[PDB]
């Protein structure tokens, strides 16, 4: 199609302009994130059973819900945890299903068995949510004036900040943590002993008293549901202000302890709406917070102690800068060689248009701009530059070597290269597309953009076959005699390169003269590539310094909120002393529990990477100082999540072993079996570190209820629960503490401070008649060592076991070994692989199959291009040369065989394949002219030397910055750099000295002949 | 293309290899199903109202829910089954509606009307499952020996098998036909009355104790104050043992609450399901039904079910083995396999014919290479379009083979002509021949595709079926055309060697064949000249042929799809309602022993308490899987004869009426093998009047010869206690709440206090009154409803026994009371004829009684309407395409005139073997019309060329026929041989192949014999009448 566009420059210009406009609009509309969503759709079901035993919770809430959920469409697996007071059922759904529809179905299935569940949970209501536990940005309002209560600050936030943030563009939810104003019934612990508490009766009286008219403008506007109104409501001396309530309550609604750098604030979490540019949304939030800060009564200073958007923005900046600098370097190299400003301008114009077309296609398919997208964009710009530069170089050499006018030179050059261009486009497509077939969306994105960037070279089949030929036909002007080659650096460089080309041709002739030796050298290259590939660790994503670290203080099942705050303060002080933390906002609860008193979350934002340049000031080293040194206390399990990777799914050899099947075996029996299995796994060499992730059994106490005696007596079982409520009892609620606002009322013995332990099996219980009779007479409290949380997998109480494969042992091999080690365990116990293990069990041989398919397709396409069944074999043989350099560089650097490295290796393969195809095509053309194989090969090597050198130099120098990255996203950049740079260097040199040898060998072997 | 691919053989080979690889991958990814997916989205809303009769359930649950759902988007039709104690609502939505979204809408409407439903119904829960109503798979846990009893096997299945079966993808509903091992309590109404204790109060106390006890939130979390010990007191009073359930306290007297459950009830950890008795091959085993969700492939789902069962067996307790006694998809798999083998045989036969004619291995080889490439490309296109690997698509490929070879045959023959006559090099000969024949190839392909174009425009499920076949065939033909323009030219340019020096007609049998064909050609030339001598006579003969075609097509009966030997059937053993389960299973065992003794039955699963007609103690069904078709190759051992023998063996048994049916064809469309008829009652004529109309219609069906085995699916009325509760009395007495009435009714039925933790899972707690006491005639009268004030107010105050004959269940089809009248087509009468006979007899029934067809019958009526118009449109399109091809408005008329001969052949073929006008027949008719038109083109084009050259019209026709005898015979013979295995198929899937092959074979046979003697006549007559100009 080149001839058409060469004749119609305005046509090609129009096509390019359309592409550019589409790209601009696509960038305007494209979603932006750090990483694309890869996690399978997951539905979280949460329920709260106030004051319920973990075993009780498992028996009623967990089991029924889990059993009913079985049958939902595409329910890949079900995991359930039964803690005390609450239960969580994570339902992992197979990929391809819409999370929203799955959530609706889950809600309906919950409705099916709503009645069976206990009434208290029914009041609380089962909460179903699509798994989106991504708090991207956090806003906190500290007491700037030092005169604002935590609940007061929270009131200011909810009144103003809450709604405005909800209205802000791209905000999924703005859930809050700040403490509120709820009442807390605070009776003495002798209330039952002196007269009676019977708080159930008076709370029921509270609910009954609060009433509204049922019939129409007439209504009642009288309702007393407040601490002050509790002296006016009948609270059943007895309990009231008029009766004896005395100690009312305190701390309002005690909640998440929010301290921004040891300064009280209000917890206001924010999550980005899925599909919205995080950076731009952050900007919106910032402006809105400025306005609201001006609103604030000069005590509500807004602080951002956490914003993931910053790292996303800086990484995108790094990539975009890399693109711009690469274009600049391409300009530099093309000026160095061509020495014609217009010729320099041509590819500098062509390349961005193809990039914009890639952007358009990306928006069309729905792929979102992410660090993977942009990082691979930097991979294919070199390939983008390569095709434009080879086209324009072929055009200009004809203008120089011959006297063809720009139009004629363009026509002849396109006649020479066009078919090769088509073939190369097809080959690159067939080498990049197979990456999509992987069940990893990482590879899918790294495909889609790279595929449409080789089809940006296909847009170049509408540009480098349409626009670039047109531009060369018009922008290029005939060489000004030899004025382009003066006595300056440019001219000397040109002459020197001519001398170098002569030397190179002589060396290539020498190599061809003794083919056997150099083919043996190539076989040695194969061996070296193999051995380097073997001695290389495997990884999925290189972690980087996000600029923030998360700490969780796990403490014994329940610790006094004062004690938890003490430990939090200790951690915060340690961070403020020996760590470079810009903001160290601390929030109680949260962590794994979500509101657990023992649990505590520390969101600590590091300083700028510039001041933390020292390796000891890297997030890895900073987290290393935490979790030990200061941390590591026996009871105080303070662990810092070391920059949790945004795709929290990468696992090299993690084994999600689940001893799910109970088959009736007691919990004790399952514990025994778990111990035996983990010991044997440790013994077996195929297996590596094996742990029981479940928390070890903690000390506890049980109370065998005197239910039989309560049958004999007037004491009801609910009366026994009420007596517990008197002494060890809470979590009920009230309503309308402040107007329409619904708050809670909680009974607490001896006001706030009960200070009682011997209350266990000691308190008396007045019967239905009212006679004081200790339930301890027949009910007994006994010390125990029960488990903290009960985990059930797929409807079977399970012991989640996490293990890795031993060094050098295959992950699947180790999984088979795990199964065999289990084999022989007591009957009723079985295994069920989950997560990475489950997916691997489903299919793990996709990679070799699609690689072989890609090789076959490439061979067939090359056979079509060369019109022979033998010539492509050389192009196939070219491949390992590029791999050699990537392996060498990654080995010297010490970086692992990460996804970045693999994709860069594929890109290097593509570049070297393009160069080889060009070389061999030109050599074949010369041979078909009549020139002997040797001489034709030498001529092709001479001709296809300068474009290859220019391509390699430009791309390598563009990649060098990434290979020398300094923090702020350094990991991924250096992986990509190292890989691509090594591949480029070795690929280029070995190619220009071996591909002629390959063609010569094939020609001699298969007796290639003229047409 | 032609010259391009000729000059670059490597490129052509590369393209073909790419197509082959794509086909291989597509086959690897293509789904497999017997018939193209035609299942409409269906959602079954099931509810239970224990202690309520069919009338009570109808008026309290089914009516309200049906009214609410009425008006939903899509919702093609609504089927309501108000059984006694259970409500069923099958809502069938229109094809294409998102099943999940429809289910969501149903859930929303259920939410709307939930507040008006009985509270007990809410407690039981309304299960809205997007499932079908046909038991595709059965899983039976057989004990090795008496290690596990029925209850043990049922519990094991529920603990492990049930959840995993529900977990697999594609399953819609897993019915349980075993036991649940749930706490069974048996309160004595006599004892309760003697102690003046209401059963509801007992239920309340049991639920009270069953409820798990709780604690507070002080001493562990928040502010535990001085709690260094965890001291999170773990409630230890939950009751599991039946003794503990007995211990539950009841009304406490002055002496004490000595009255417990044990005093007035029998507590035992027995099974909860007493209404299902399952035996596999006369071996007691628990059973779990599996109904595939609509939209599932139902083969891969079966495979994954088998894999999951394998793993569970790996973890089964010693002595438990899973077994599948009834699988529908196995026939699908084996039939697809057989069709593939038939395709291979057809390829071999076509190769044989082409070698017999060309007599050169390479020239014969080229089309043989062409065939599979086109087939694989068609497979890839099918994958792109979503067409699954179906019997019709595979039929399309099998028919395609012979329609694909011909193009390559023509190309090769032209290349041979030029290479030999003009002494051209294979390259040059190929180039010139391709230059001359490319347009002809493209045109012929276009006409062929045109003939199939309208058949893709059918509507409905038959629309999908015809579309799949037609598109498959058309794509195959298009690929053949492309290959004949790309691959075949290259192969002829390179593979074809120059004609062997002095080719002495390949002396031998080939030489004899050539000489005999030359003599036959002379005789044929003389015959054609004789026909042309007196054109009027032979044209009159052709008009007579048209009349014969019309007569035959009128006589031919119309049907939907031929029945096949599925290899599995179902024996509905019906007993009078109320018949004890024990003797019902005894009769079922009699039937099973008869099966084992005489019939070739591999597996005979027998379940008592389940039937398509209804679920009851009398109801029973035997899912029997036959032995392999190879062992049952004898006609007497085919499924039909077996079913007839079973029916006759247990005929004349009103005490135990036994009816055997074959597995319903197209199970997705309908669950009834015979045509399904709904006798709805639009007008308020009345239930009794509807009964009278039903009986009258059934008598008419019995006397009508065209109808057989026409009966009411629902069981007859049984004498039952018609306990009525006005519930206004409940208002006056102070109860003012049906909840206590509901508790008493479910005490008569099955009351559930709640659930208790058992072993690893949670089992149920049931309180059913003792069997003898429960069946007590005046137990309801003697019992007292607990008043709101606790008063033992006599339940008889608003209880009226009033024993009366009552229907066991009620059916409301499309919001109208209806009676399901299933019927079978009598021998010698097609399904369409049987349905029309049912309609004719329906005329004369009283007003307000409306006839209706559902399932396959509805689709059959829909298919019948649109059949002729699309065929006429096919004829029109073909005529216009030919007119374009010949660049005249006269010449195409002859090619159109050719069609009736092929139609005659198809009609004769089906008439001789008694095959009705089914879907396969119409498909074969379309294909035959196409190929006959192709041959007519082949002859007429040469005739036209000769005429315009200067040869006289008669001379032109004669010479064209002489030159075309060999190609026409070759192509027709290739196609015919390719279709031969279909007509001669025997085994699983034999019926479909026999139908289509018979039609196509007859058509092609006449579309050649009649063609070679009338197409020249047609050309001569047209040339004379329309004065064809020599231009």
3-class secondary structure, B532: helix
Interface check for B166 against chain A (CB to CB < 8 A): the answer is yes
> Any idea what the Cα angle at residue A307 is, between residues A302 and A308, rounded to 5°?
175
> Is A565 in CB contact (< 8 Å) with chain B?
no
Distance between CA A31 and CA A363 in Å, rounded?
8
For residue A89, what are the β-bridge partners? Answer: A45, A80
Decide if A709 touches B, using CB distance below 8 A.
Answer: no
Burial label for B95, CB within 10 Å (0-12, 13-18, 19+), is middle
**Which of helix, strand or coil describes residue A449?**
helix
- State the Cα–Cα distance between residues B835 and B824, nearest whole angstrom: 9
* Buried/exposed code over A588-621 (b: 16+ C-beta within 10 A; e: otherwise): bbbbebebbbbbbbbbbbbeebeebeeeebbbee
Rounded Cα distance between A795 and B361, Å, is 65
CB count, 10 Å around CB of A532? 16
Q: What 8-state DSSP symbol labels residue A61?
A: I
Distance CA A856, CA B534 (A): 64
Cα separation, A59 vs A61, whole angstroms = 6
Burial of B641 (0-12, 13-18, 19+ CB in 10 A): middle
Question: Are the C-beta atoms of A736 and A210 separated by less than 8 Å?
Answer: yes
Beta-carbon count within 10 A of A827 CB: 13
Phi, psi torsion values for B125, nearest 5 degrees: 95, 135
CA dihedral A152, A155, A160, A161 (to 10 degrees): 90
- In chain B, residues 964-993 whose CB comes closer than 8 Å to chain A: none
Those residues with Cβ within 8 angstroms of residue B890's Cβ, 6 or more apart along the chain or in another chain = B1022, B1025, B1026, B1028
* B325 and B625 Cβ atoms separated by less than 8 Å: yes
Return the exposure string of A806-823: e unless at least 16 CB atoms fall within 10 Å of the residue's CB, then b: beebebeebbebbeebbe
How many residues are recorded in chain A? 1011
Sheet arrangement for strand A800-805: A655-658, A800-805, A687-692
Other beta carbons less than 10 A from residue B938's beta carbon = 20
- Find residue A129's DSSP bridge partners: A44
Torsion of CA B58, B59, B62, B65, to 10 degrees: 170
Q: Which of B125, B220, B238 sits opposite A112 (nearest CB)?
A: B125
User: Which distant-in-sequence residues (6+ apart) come within 8 Å of A148 by Cβ?
Assistant: A156, A299, A300
Give the sign of the dihedral formed by CA B492, CA B494, CA B496, CA B497: positive
Alpha helix ranges (H) inside B115-255: 119-124, 150-156, 162-167, 189-194, 199-210, 242-247
Q: Which residues contact B620 (CB under 8 A, 6 or more apart)?
A: B572, B573, B574, B575, B584, B585, B587, B588, B606, B607, B608, B609, B610, B611
Show residues of chain A in contact with B7, CB under 8 Å: none
- A169 in helix, strand or coil? coil
- For residues A837 and B889, give the distance between their C-alpha atoms in angstroms, rounded to a whole number: 70
Q: Measured between CA atoms, how close is B731 to chain A, in angstroms?
A: 22
Among B702, B722, B718, CA closest to B710: B702
Measured distance CA(A949)–CA(A910) in Å, rounded: 16
CA–CA separation, A306 vs A285, rounded Å?
A: 13
Beta carbons of B468 and B387 less than 8 angstroms apart:
yes
Distance CA B4, CA B485 (A): 10
- CA atoms within 13 A of residue B664's CA, in its CB half-sphere: 22
Q: Are B180 and B272 in contact (CB under 8 A)?
A: yes
d(CA A538, CA A897): 5
CA dist B89 and B82 (Å) reads 8
Among chain A residues, the shortest Cα distance to B260 is held by A711
Pairing between β-strand A581-588 and β-strand A600-606 as defined by DSSP bridges? antiparallel
Question: For residues A312 and A371, is the Cβ–Cβ distance under 8 A?
Answer: yes
Long-range contact set of residues B555-558: C-beta below 8 Å, sequence gap at least 24: B555/B911, B556/B907, B556/B910, B556/B911, B556/B916, B556/B917, B557/B829, B557/B830, B557/B832, B557/B833, B557/B916, B557/B917, B558/B830, B558/B832, B558/B833, B558/B864, B558/B916, B558/B917, B558/B918
d(CA A163, CA A74): 37
Query: Are residues B123 and A108, on separate chains, in Cβ contact within 8 Å?
Result: no
Contacts of A930 (CB under 8 A, 6+ apart): A1010
Q: Is A727 on the interface with B (CB under 8 A)?
A: yes
Q: What does the longest C-alpha to C-alpha distance in chain B come to?
A: 128
Backbone angles phi, psi at B425, to 5 degrees: -65, 155
Burial of B554 (0-12, 13-18, 19+ CB in 10 A): exposed
Nearest to B760 among A664, A705, A867 (CB): A664
- Distance, in Å, from the CA atom of B738 to the CA atom of A204, rounded to the nearest integer, reads 26
DSSP helix/strand/coil, A133: coil
Give the bridge partners for A781, in sequence order: A703
The helix-helix angle for A467-474 and A341-365 (nearest 10°) equals: 160
| Closest residue by Cα to residue A827 from A661, A943, A990 | A661
3-state secondary structure of A285: helix
Q: How far apart are the first and last CA of chain B?
A: 29
DSSP collapsed to 3 states, A707-720: HHHHHHCCCCHHHH
Please report which helix (H) or strand (E) contains residue B94, including its range. none
With beta carbons less than 8 A apart as the criterion, state whether A936 and A929 touch.
Answer: yes
Query: Which class for A737: exposed (0-12), middle (13-18), buried (19 or more C-beta within 10 A)?
Result: buried
Are β-strands B816-825 and B809-813 bridged in parallel, bridged antiparallel, or unpaired?
A: antiparallel
Name the residue among A557, A750, A796 with its Cβ closest to that of B230: A557
Do strands B761-767 and B183-187 pair parallel, antiparallel, or not at all (unpaired)?
Answer: parallel
Contact A864 B107 (CB under 8 A): no
Distance CA A498, CA B382 (A): 58
Return the residue in B44, B225, B313 with the most chain A beta carbons within 10 A, the one to mutate for interface testing.
Answer: B225
Q: Which residues pair with B187 in a beta bridge?
A: B265
| B856-886 helix and B831-842 helix, angle to the nearest 10 degrees | 120
Interface of A with B in 210-269 (CB under 8 A): 254
Helical segments of A125-240, H only: 150-156, 163-167, 191-194, 199-209
Four-CA torsion B776, B779, B780, B785, nearest 10 degrees? -150
CA distance B332 to A323: 57
| Residues B318 and B196 sit within 8 Å (Cβ to Cβ) | no
After which residues does chain B have a break in its backbone, defined as C to next N over 2.5 Å? none
How far apart are the C-alpha atoms of B309 and B287, rounded to whole Å?
A: 13
CA A271 centroid distance within chain: 15
Whole-angstrom Cα distance, residue B941 to residue B885? 9
Closest CA to B601 of B128, B866, B282, B823: B282
- Contact present, B447 and B881 (Cβ < 8 Å): yes
Strand B707-712 to strand B816-825: parallel, antiparallel, or no bridges (unpaired)?
antiparallel
List Cβ neighbours of A392 (8 Å cut-off, separation of 6 or more): A334, A338, A343, A346, A347, A468, A472, A476
Give chain B's radius of gyration (CA, Å): 36
How far, in Å, are A297, A558, B59, B109 from residue A955 at the CA level? 56, 59, 79, 63
Give the C-alpha separation, A164 to A444, whole Å. 37
What is the Cα B646 distance to its own chain's centre?
24
Q: Which of B1009, B986, B1010, B981 is nearest to B997 (CA)?
A: B981
Question: What resolution in angstrom units was achieved for this structure?
Answer: 3.6
Name the residue facing A85 among B127, B217, B226 (closest C-beta): B217
SS3 A766: strand
Contact call for residues B165 and B735 (beta carbons, < 8 A):
no
Q: How was it solved?
A: cryo-EM
What does the alpha-carbon distance between residue B622 and residue B287 come to, in Å, rounded to a whole number? 12
Spatial distance between the Cα atoms of A586 and A593, rounded to a whole number of angstroms: 16
Say if CB B496 and CB B398 are below 8 A apart. no
Report how far residue B798's alpha carbon sits from residue B727's, in angstroms, rounded to the nearest whole number.
7
Q: Are B163 and A795 in contact (CB under 8 A)?
A: yes
Q: Do A420 and A446 form a contact (C-beta atoms < 8 A)?
A: no
Q: Which residues contact A785 (CB under 8 A, 6 or more apart)?
A: A697, A698, A699, A700
Q: Are B795 and B784 in contact (CB under 8 A)?
A: yes
In Å, how far are A39, A87, A123, A946, B15 from A127, measured between CA atoms? 21, 11, 12, 66, 57
Cα–Cα distance measured from residue A474 to residue A459, given in angstroms and rounded to the nearest whole number: 20
Distance CA A409, CA A397 (A): 9
How far apart CA B891 and CA B896 sit, in angstroms, is 9
Cβ A757–B226 below 8 Å, yes or no? yes
Q: How far apart are CA B433 and CA B427, in angstroms?
A: 10
Cα(A271)–Cα(B733) distance, rounded to whole angstroms?
58
Find the helix or strand (DSSP H, E) in which A107 lies: helix A99-112
DSSP-derived 3-state class of residue A939? helix
Residue pair A886/A357 in contact by the 8 Å Cβ criterion: no
Q: Are B626 and B638 spatial neighbours (Cβ–Cβ below 8 Å)?
A: no
CA atoms within 13 A on the CB side of B828: 2
Asked if A581 contacts A655 with a C-beta cutoff of 8 angstroms, the reply is: no
List CB contacts of A93: < 8 A, sequence separation 6 or more.
A40, A41, A42, A43, A72, A74, A75, A76, A99, A102
Q: Which of A707, A786, A828 sits opposite B237 (nearest CB)?
A: A707
Report the length, in residues, of chain B. 1031
Residue A26 to residue A357: CA distance in whole angstroms: 9
Rounded CA separation B420/A340 (Å): 62
C-alpha span between B988 and B565 (Å, rounded): 6
The strand pairing partners of B757, in sequence order, are B762
In the sheet that holds B265-268, the strands lie side by side as B265-268, B183-187, B761-767, B751-758
Instruction: Give start and end residues of each alpha helix (H) in B784-918.
Output: 831-842, 856-886, 891-912
Whole-number Å distance between alpha carbons of B959 and B942: 9
Q: Is there a contact between B409 and B967 (Cβ–Cβ < 8 Å)?
A: yes
Give dist(CA A888, CA A692) in Å, integer.
39
CA dist., res. B441 & res. B439, Å (int): 5
CB B722 within 8 A of CB B806: yes
In terms of Cα–Cα distance, which of B724, B697, B721, B723 is closest to B711? B697
Contact B218 A749 (CB under 8 A): yes
Alpha carbons A264 and B426: distance in angstroms, whole number: 94
B391-421 and B990-1009 helices, crossing angle to 10° = 30
CA proximity to A336, closest of A488, A126, A146, A152: A488
Residue A131: CB partners within 8 Å, gap ≥ 6? Answer: A39, A41, A42, A43, A44, A90, A99
């Amino acid at each position: 199609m080149a001839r058409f566009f060469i004749d119609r420059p305005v046509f090609a210009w129009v096509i390019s302009l359309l592409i550019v406009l589409a790209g601009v609009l696509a960038i305007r509309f494209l979603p932006v994130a750090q990483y694309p969503d890869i996690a399978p759709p997951v539905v979280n079901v949460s329920a709260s059973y106030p004051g319920a035993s973990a075993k009780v919770v498992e028996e009623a809430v967990t089991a029924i819900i889990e059993r009913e959920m079985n049958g939902a469409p595409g329910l890949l697996y079900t995991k359930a945890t039964s803690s005390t007071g609450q239960a969580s059922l994570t339902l992992t759904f197979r990929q391809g299903v819409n999370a929203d529809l799955a959530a609706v179905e889950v809600q309906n299935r919950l409705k099916i068995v709503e009645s069976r569940l206990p009434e208290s949970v029914r009041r609380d209501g089962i909460y179903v949510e699509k798994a989106a536990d991504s708090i991207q940005l956090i806003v906190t309002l500290t007491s700037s004036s030092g005169r604002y209560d935590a609940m007061e600050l929270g009131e200011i936030a909810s009144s103003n900040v809450l709604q405005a943030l909800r209205r802000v563009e791209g905000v999924g939810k703005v859930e809050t943590w700040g403490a509120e104003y709820a009442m807390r019934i605070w009776p003495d612990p002798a209330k039952l002993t002196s007269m009676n508490l019977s708080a159930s009766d008076l709370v029921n009286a509270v609910r009954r008293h609060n009433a509204r008219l049922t019939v129409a403008t007439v209504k009642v506007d009288d309702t007393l549901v407040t601490p002050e109104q509790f002296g006016e409501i009948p609270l059943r001396g007895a309990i009231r202000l008029r009766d004896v309530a005395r100690v009312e309550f305190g701390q309002s609604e005690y909640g998440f302890v929010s301290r921004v750098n040891q300064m009280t604030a209000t917890g206001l979490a924010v999550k980005m709406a899925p599909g919205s540019n995080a950076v731009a949304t952050a900007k919106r939030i910032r402006a809105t917070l400025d306005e609201l800060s001006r609103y604030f009564p000069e005590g509500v200073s807004y602080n951002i102690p956490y914003d993931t958007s910053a790292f996303v923005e800086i990484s995108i900046r790094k990539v975009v800068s890399t693109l711009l600098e690469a274009m600049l370097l391409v300009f530099a190299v093309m000026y160095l060689f061509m020495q014609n400003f217009r010729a320099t301008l041509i590819p500098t114009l062509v390349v961005p248009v193809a990039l914009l077309g890639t952007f358009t296609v990306m928006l069309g398919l729905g792929f979102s701009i992410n660090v993977l997208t942009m990082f691979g964009m930097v991979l294919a710009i070199g390939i983008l530059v390569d095709d434009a530069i080879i086209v324009v170089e072929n055009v200009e050499r004809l203008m120089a070597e011959e006297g063809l006018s720009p139009h004629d030179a363009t026509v002849k050059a396109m006649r020479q290269i066009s078919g090769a261009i088509v073939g190369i486009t097809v080959v690159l497509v067939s080498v990049f597309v197979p990456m999509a077939f992987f069940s990893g969306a990482v590879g899918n994105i790294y495909r889609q953009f790279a595929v449409t960037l080789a089809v940006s070279i296909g847009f170049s089949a509408f540009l480098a076959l349409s626009l670039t030929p047109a531009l060369c036909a018009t922008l290029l002007r005939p060489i000004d005699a030899d004025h382009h080659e003066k006595r300056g650096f440019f001219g000397w460089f040109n002459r020197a390169f001519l001398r170098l080309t002569g030397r190179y041709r002589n060396a290539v002739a020498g190599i061809l003269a003794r083919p056997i030796r150099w083919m043996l050298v190539y076989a040695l290259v194969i061996g070296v590539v193999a051995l380097l590939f073997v001695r290389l660790p495997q990884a999925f994503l290189p972690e980087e310094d996000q600029g923030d670290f998360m700490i969780m203080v796990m403490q014994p099942e329940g610790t006094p909120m004062a004690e938890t705050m003490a430990n939090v303060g200790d951690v915060e002080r340690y961070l403020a002393e020996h760590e470079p933390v810009a903001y160290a906002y601390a929030v109680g609860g949260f962590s794994l529990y979500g509101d657990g008193t023992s649990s505590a979350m520390i969101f600590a934002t590091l300083k700028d990477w510039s001041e933390r340049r020292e390796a000891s000031q890297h997030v890895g080293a900073i987290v290393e100082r935490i979790n030990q040194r200061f941390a590591g206390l026996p009871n105080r399990t303070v662990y810092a999540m070391n920059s949790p990777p945004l795709p929290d799914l990468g696992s090299t050899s993690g084994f999600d072993f689940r001893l799910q099947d109970r088959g009736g075996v007691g919990y004790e029996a399952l514990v025994k079996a778990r111990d035996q299995l983990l010991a044997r796994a440790a013994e077996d060499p195929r297996l590596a570190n094996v742990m029981f992730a479940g928390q070890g059994e903690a000390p506890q106490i049980r109370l065998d209820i005197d239910r039989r005696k309560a049958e004999t007596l007037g004491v009801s079982m609910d009366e026994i629960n009420t007596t517990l409520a008197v002494m060890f009892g809470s979590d009920y609620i009230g309503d309308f503490m402040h107007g329409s606002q619904v708050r809670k009322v909680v009974v607490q013995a001896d006001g706030a401070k009960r200070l009682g332990i011997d209350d266990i099996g000691r308190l008396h219980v007045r019967n239905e008649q009212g006679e004081m009779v200790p339930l301890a007479t027949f009910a007994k409290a006994a010390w125990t060592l029960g488990p903290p949380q009960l985990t059930r997998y797929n409807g079977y109480p399970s012991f989640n076991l996490e293990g890795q494969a031993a060094p050098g042992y295959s992950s699947g091999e180790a999984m088979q070994a795990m199964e065999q080690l289990m084999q022989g365990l007591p009957e009723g116990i079985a295994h069920e692989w989950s997560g990475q293990s489950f997916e691997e069990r489903l299919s793990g041989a996709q990679a070799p199959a699609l690689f072989a398919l890609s090789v076959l397709i490439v061979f067939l396409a090359l056979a079509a291009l060369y019109e022979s069944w033998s010539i492509p074999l050389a192009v196939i043989l070219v491949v390992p040369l590029g791999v050699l350099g990537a392996l060498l560089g990654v080995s010297l650097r010490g970086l692992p065989n990460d996804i970045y490295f693999k994709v860069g290796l594929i890109t290097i393969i593509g570049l070297s394949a393009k160069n080889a195809i060009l070389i061999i095509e030109v050599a074949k053309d010369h041979y078909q002219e009549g020139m002997s194989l040797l001489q034709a090969t030498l001529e092709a090597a001479r001709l296809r030397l300068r474009p290859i050198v220019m391509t390699s130099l430009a791309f390598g120098f563009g990649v060098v910055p990434l290979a020398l990255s300094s923090g702020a996203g350094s990991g991924a950049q250096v992986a990509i750099g190292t890989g691509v740079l090594g591949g480029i260097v070795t690929a280029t040199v070995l190619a220009v000295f071996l591909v002629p040898l390959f063609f010569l060998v094939v020609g001699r072997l298969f007796r290639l002949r003229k047409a």
